């Protein structure tokens, strides 16, 4: 209601969120653009507790796809974004690794969103698909990294039991487990979305859809990325089980030689 002295802060930039903005043509029209944060939340029908869904924090970010009347709010891995029928906001981060990945997203998103060859797909779904593709590329890279090292160590151990190899395996398994957990959350989120016709219908921002309308094209789109995500869940789960099995087998062998 009224103005009062503010709580002390290290930098007044903390009153703003910053982002990259894409126009209705799909072109980037600003980078590092600042918006007053509480006002921005209110304007986009978000509550103060939703600040983390658009701010520069990168810890404890739960995956989300909020299908609001006039926008889709997305948090997936390094990406926080707000998609409208004729604009996209991609939010800044303090995480260097995330910032590097976001730079590639910007390029690919601008390409796909602004394309004059793709006039069959709604703007908001071009943005959605660009984001899904960028998310899956990040998962692909991590999955290949951690699974390949674990498979190598497992093969090494099957050839000859070795305590140093075993320690290495279980250390590397931590990474695989973290990968499984974050991917599982995304898989379950996409599953929920596919099962909710109200959310699906809401995802059409350019044309108005009823829950009873045909969403085949949007469903095919989401299914594509659901399947890729789900396969990473299945593969990482199976590999983790293989590691647990191997730990148990090695344990028995170690006991038998005591």
The residues, any chain, with a CB within 8 Å of residue 139's CB and separated by 6 or more, are 77, 179, 183, 186, 228, 229, 232
C-alpha Rg value of the chain to the nearest Å:
22
CB neighbours of residue 135 within 10 Å: 22
Q: Beta-strand (E) ranges in the chain?
A: 16-22, 28-36, 64-67, 72-76, 79-83, 88-91
Residue carrying structure tokens 């981060």: 93
Within 94-162, residue ranges assigned H as helices are 96-114, 123-159
Residue carrying structure tokens 């701010």: 55
Distance CA 40, CA 228 (A): 34
Distance CA 127, CA 118 (A): 12
Torsion of CA 214, 217, 220, 224, to 10 degrees: -150
| CA angle 124–121–103, rounded 5-degree value | 55
| CA angle 42–47–52, rounded 5-degree value | 105
Domains of the chain and CATH, by start: 1-94 (2.40.128.330), 95-258 (1.20.58.340)
DSSP string across 153-178: HHHHHHHS--HHHHHHHHHHHHHHHH
Elucidated via: X-ray
Contact 78, 102 (CB under 8 A): yes
Distance CA 38, CA 208 (A): 29
Q: Is the dihedral of CA 180, 182, 187, 191 positive or negative?
A: positive
């Amino acid at each position: 209601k009224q103005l009062l002295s503010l709580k002390p802060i290290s930098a007044s930039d903390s009153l703003f969120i910053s982002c990259t903005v894409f126009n209705s043509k799909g072109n980037i029209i600003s980078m590092s653009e600042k918006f007053p944060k509480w006002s921005f939340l209110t304007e986009h029908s978000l509550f103060p507790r939703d600040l983390r869904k658009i701010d520069n924090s990168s810890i404890d970010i739960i995956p989300t796809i909020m299908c609001k009347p006039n926008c889709i709010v997305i948090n997936l891995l390094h990406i926080k974004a707000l998609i409208e029928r004729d604009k996209v906001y991609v939010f800044d981060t303090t995480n260097p690794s995330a910032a590097a990945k976001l730079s590639v997203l910007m390029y690919d998103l601008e390409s796909k969103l602004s394309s004059t060859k793709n006039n069959s797909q709604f703007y908001e779904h071009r943005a959605l698909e660009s984001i899904f593709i960028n998310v899956m590329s990040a998962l692909e890279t991590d999955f290949k990294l951690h699974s390949q090292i674990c498979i190598q160590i497992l093969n090494d151990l099957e050839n000859e039991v070795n305590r140093l190899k075993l320690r290495h395996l279980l250390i590397k398994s931590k990474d695989l487990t973290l990968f499984y957990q974050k991917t599982l959350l995304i898989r379950d989120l996409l599953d929920e979305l596919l099962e909710n016709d109200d959310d699906l219908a809401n995802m059409y921002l350019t044309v108005k859809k009823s829950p009873k309308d045909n969403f085949s094209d949007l469903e095919m789109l989401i299914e594509t990325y659901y399947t890729q995500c789900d396969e990473y869940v299945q593969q990482s789960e199976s590999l983790i089980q293989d590691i647990k099995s191997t730990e148990e087998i090695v344990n028995i062998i170690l006991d038998a030689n005591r």
